[PDB]
Design an enzyme around this catalytic site. Structure first.
Site, PDB file in Angstrom:
ATOM      1  CD  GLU B 255     -27.214 -38.477 -12.467  1.00  0.00           C
ATOM      2  OE1 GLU B 255     -27.126 -39.023 -11.348  1.00  0.00           O
ATOM      3  OE2 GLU B 255     -27.312 -37.242 -12.616  1.00  0.00           O
ATOM      4  CB  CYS B 294     -24.626 -34.572 -14.118  1.00  0.00           C
ATOM      5  SG  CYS B 294     -25.574 -34.325 -12.599  1.00  0.00           S
TER       6      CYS B 294
END
Lengths: 678, 678, 60
Positions: B255, B294
């Site tokens: 990620e 994020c």
């Protein structure tokens, strides 16, 4: 002879250092492959901006019909595929698998796309995920087809099947493919691609082909691309660390070499029928395609007391295997695809001989013959847990070692010691041994067949990967999965969790969501045809008051004299507090409320999706039903005589006078169409 | 101060070149991180041979109860977690997300493991795949937990959540975890791990910890291991090309950083409430956790006519944002975690200013302050199509650039030009605009929130990734997927397609499937308690002859006068040929046949899983029902006053005098247990 | 038995009432002529019903 490459809509050929294809059973070179000087950027550009939007403009039902049309058109002219596959050194029973398994994979993916996929560009895989208290914020997952190419790099084993088992989830998954077959046998692959392109069934740019090295293709891929490798382990590990693949973070699926085990259980004795089908399965799987398939048995785990019996029965069955030309009579095993592949087999055989033993004709194989023949080799390893070369080296032909176990505890360790295999087999009659085998050995095997007398009647065997079973395996076998039914079409899609209001998710999904807006338009929904039903067409039915006489008449008529409906004493001590209306009578009176009595487009019911009785319905409790349309999904009218129709799903929300939902469920219904297509 | 690392069952600390953790809001060093000299091979060895069989010996229901117990024990002592998370520069509302979202993730995975997971070591996800015409050969997909460790390499953003949203699918999937937190905030992670370990709930070896570099962990991983990464792209792309990861072919999930979008539509005018909630969403998502999450909005796409209104309303709303100490009142935004992260944000701003513009306080950031303060920054790009630095560079803080669009065709292209994002937003009130947005922009986004007036009331927002929605994204966002409900526990399992006879698959799966052996033992199956039921306990009910009077009485009582049941003329003109029995009456008479009338362990019914009517039932057509037990799956008895019970599933097979299966389906049923547990 | 039955409801006579008060609902006594028949289309059991139907707009 030029073996061309279908790039940018045209049949182009390379200009450079050219490898060549040998005729496998005789030895002459009758093709030569090259792709030098071919613009791969222009091919990827033509695919992405020509055939990708043409596939993304079709629905899943239309793309499954395209798969079925290509399947029928490729099943029609199938004998030229046998003529091109006879050059590969395979027999008729091997080329039959190679052609018909791929074409039946196309028919199976056409059926699975025609049954469980929507009449839409998008596919919502969830039902609904509620994320709020009032019901104004929910979510559901969406699967949109990616906007790029699908570079399939295949192996020399199955040109037709191994190209064509990756192409049906790719086309059904809305992506165009660029197939790079192995250069050993790409002539059957170009026969397949030519029969696909010269039919008008698929759009232009939806399929491409390169015979030879790609060269500049992997250095140009966007993040919407996928690469599906199949072949040797070292080449796939070098392509995994390719800098554009790790930089743009594209999905790289690898299928590598594997040591597929076949474990014999302690319950099997040679008088049982299990022993004969064990020996038959091992011999048939090792001699099919001359051991040139990835699902071929390469390790045989036997009990310690059954080493001599299996090692005699396998030799007595394998000495009747004739290794020769396929066109001459009495020949069972064909040959390998190349003399270089014969040398690559024997250089692994000599590694296995450096620490093992020998039972039969092993390294005795002529490396200068007029044919890539190799005798059926049965090896032996007296110390299986103390020899790492057995559990790490595969000889990619008719070679399979034999090794003992100790009372189904060493057998599980020898099955798991392969570093992750592609397939496995246990042959037992005791189901507890099968339970203990799946509980430990399915961590390393992507597929396990448990073979007994009842299974072996209509079994496909071990070298026929089903298109609705996962063709994969962890570790040494690659790690990636293929052929998972509808799991394989999801690798060619992007999963997105779409949030928002349910009335917004209903128009995003083109399918009605539990808390969405309705469209009541004064006429009955079952009176509408298919083309005038919309997802959201709701009916608010009249009320029906449930009473004690309703409970009595339904418990009499159905025969369900359950104590929570027909007993005042026992229902008082139950969780409900008193006797309640039957749930199936709530269902039946609901259907009495919303079903139109007259003749209309509604043909049959045959379906009920998910019934949950939430709160009990009592005597003196009114019942009102909210019949709303949810999903349309027409059928392709497989014959010109059959009536055009679609399978319309209705979400049914029943409630009471307090407006709380009791017994919300969903029904399927075949609704006739007004206008047909085929 | 020593910040240790839980390895091999003991709290250990390294001895070498130690990095040190600065306090965020003040600046002093009050922790130090090192892992040099710690034996990582012994840590992985202790985990695999101590905590992996302990977790794999549990069932999924027991592992979900373990997750719920850890959630309660970690929710009890939650204030020390806020005390340790206040050192990371976050406020109380910013640490509330980090703590309570992870604890709610634990409760959510406990609920998902309690509702839809079996009481078995293994989990069959399919129903049945028939592969034979006779029925003696079938298959289904199993999911066995892997026999290795999960290496979780987290970012500095969410220690508690980002460790704890990966730890619940790992434990619920069945693997021990080794967590490597980022060395900027590992003290909260060790507080979490210590609160887990000092409770006696998890087994030993089931969780590990390294506060510092792994060093030799990735070089020792077996093929049964998985690695999950969260952080910068330059680190994770170098950990993807690690030679043991590509050699043993272990799943590497990454990620990376993404350019999340918030597209404004053409329908939104500033007199509507959509404009104010658009501005509020952008401001809240940019200021929450100081923009160090994020899923933070970093590209605001507005129409060209709405540039000035958005670019003034954002300034008027963001000048109210006070950036200071979290403990003093009237402070909205906290601070960044380090001065190094402040320098990284300022140099990414200086890269973005090489071609962009400026609206607010941007590159002016005091590097000499005693605290990692960065002001809220709103940039501007007048030429978004001619500036690749906007679509390739993220400033990981309160920075979010603004750029115009041209009538919903340029907006989709600018939303897709981010190279694959982790999250996205469209704020419209038109559902067709949202449909067109999902039709193109879901290929690059793993999550899209369509925000309107109805959704904005009870929404969780844009920076709280739900534990039952996919937290992933293609390309620049990493490529992997997390938190997808029960999709995340399948990254820790191996999917094995198990073949065989159905009587063998039933003993493998511990669930009666379709054609297995039965066990009829002279007493009724609804009279059995939970512990004395077995999957396969069958019941052959007596018969009932369907007649015309049955159709009449059910069509009267239900009120369903459908023409294929109540009309002699139209049923002759239909597909059935004559009028048939109601399918719901076949269901009701089936339940009249198999349901025992007496008071027993059966509590309620409340359920019906998959009803399909295959062949029509006529008058003069007898009906015989084969009730058989299918799936046991006890519940954990959450209190002591509640009765112990389990949700037993029964597969119901109705058939006529020709023994063809009309109306085969499956019911759920609550059956009380004999002996409780809690 | 076995003789199917189909019914032809049709409106026959409307004849509103004058709504003698202001609290009373406006209504009219609508007569329907019911024509039941079978698969041979012969009129078994034809009759006529009176039925009270509420008006939309009143007068008094």
């Amino acid at each position: 002879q030029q073996l061309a490459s279908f790039l940018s809509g045209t049949w182009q050929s390379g200009r450079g250092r050219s490898r060549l294809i040998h005729h496998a059973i005789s030895g002459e070179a009758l093709w030569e492959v090259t792709s030098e000087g071919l613009d791969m950027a222009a091919a990827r550009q033509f695919a992405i901006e020509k055939g990708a939007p043409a596939l993304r403009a079709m629905t899943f039902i239309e793309r499954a019909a395209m798969l079925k049309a290509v399947a029928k058109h490729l099943l029609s002219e199938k004998e030229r595929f046998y003529a091109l596959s006879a050059q590969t050194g395979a027999t008729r029973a091997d080329s039959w698998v190679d052609i018909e398994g791929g074409i039946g994979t196309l028919f199976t993916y056409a059926s699975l796309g025609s049954r469980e996929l929507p009449d839409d560009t998008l596919w919502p895989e969830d039902e609904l995920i509620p994320l709020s208290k009032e019901g104004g914020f929910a979510a559901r997952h969406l699967l949109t087809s990616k906007s790029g190419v699908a570079v399939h790099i295949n192996a020399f084993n199955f040109p037709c099947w191994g190209m064509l088992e990756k192409l049906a989830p790719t086309w059904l998954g809305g992506m165009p493919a660029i197939i790079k077959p192995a250069t050993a046998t790409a002539q059957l692959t170009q026969a397949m691609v030519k029969s696909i392109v010269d039919s008008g069934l698929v759009p232009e740019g939806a399929i491409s082909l390169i015979c030879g090295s790609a060269g500049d293709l992997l250095d140009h891929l966007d993040s919407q691309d996928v690469v599906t490798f199949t072949g040797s382990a070292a080449t796939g590990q070098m392509l995994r660390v390719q800098p554009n693949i790790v930089a743009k973070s594209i999905p790289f699926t690898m299928e590598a070499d594997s040591l597929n085990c076949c474990v014999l259980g302690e319950d099997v004795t040679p008088d049982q029928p299990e022993f004969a089908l064990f020996i038959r399965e091992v011999v048939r799987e090792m001699t099919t395609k001359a051991g040139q398939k990835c699902t071929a048995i390469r390790r045989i785990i036997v009990p310690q007391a059954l080493v001599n019996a299996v090692s005699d029965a396998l030799v007595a069955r394998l000495q009747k295997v004739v290794v020769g030309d396929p066109a001459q009579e009495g020949v069972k095993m064909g040959a390998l695809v190349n003399a270089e592949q014969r040398a690559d087999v024997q250089e692994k055989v000599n590694i296995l001989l450096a620490a093992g033993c020998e039972i039969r004709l092993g390294g005795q194989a002529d490396l200068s013959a007029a044919g890539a023949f190799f005798p059926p080799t049965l090896l032996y390893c007296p110390q299986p847990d103390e020899t790492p070369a057995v559990h790490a080296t595969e000889a990619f032909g008719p070679v399979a070692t034999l090794m003992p176990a100790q009372n189904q505890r060493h057998a599980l360790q020898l099955a798991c010691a392969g570093g992750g295999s592609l397939a496995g087999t246990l042959v037992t009659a005791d189901p507890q041994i099968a339970r203990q085998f799946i509980a430990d050995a399915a961590r390393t095997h992507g597929r396990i067949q448990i073979l007994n007398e009842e299974s072996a009647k209509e079994s496909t065997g071990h070298g026929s990967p089903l298109p609705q079973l996962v063709h994969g395996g962890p570790g040494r076998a690659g790690g990636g999965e293929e052929l998972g039914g509808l799991r394989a079409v999801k690798h060619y899609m992007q999963r997105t969790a779409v949030q928002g209001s349910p009335t917004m998710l209903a128009a995003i999904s083109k399918q009605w969501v539990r808390g969405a807006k309705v469209e009541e338009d004064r006429i009955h929904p079952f009176r509408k045809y298919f083309e005038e039903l919309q997802p959201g067409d709701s009916l608010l039915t009249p009320r029906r008051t449930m009473t004690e006489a309703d409970i009595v008449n339904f418990a009499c008529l159905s025969g369900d004299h359950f104590y929570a409906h027909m007993d005042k004493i026992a229902a008082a001590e139950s969780i409900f507090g008193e006797r309640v209306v039957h749930g199936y009578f709530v269902l039946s009176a609901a259907a009495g409320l919303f079903v139109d009595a007259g003749v209309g487009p509604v043909i049959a019911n045959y379906g009920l999706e998910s019934l949950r009785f939430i709160e009990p319905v009592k005597p003196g409790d009114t019942i009102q039903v909210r019949l709303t349309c949810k999903r349309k999904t027409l059928k392709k009218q497989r014959s010109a005589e059959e009536k055009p129709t679609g399978v319309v799903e209705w979400a049914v929300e029943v409630f009471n006078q307090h407006q709380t939902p009791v017994a919300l469920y969903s029904i399927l219904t075949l609704v006739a169409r007004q206008h047909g297509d085929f």
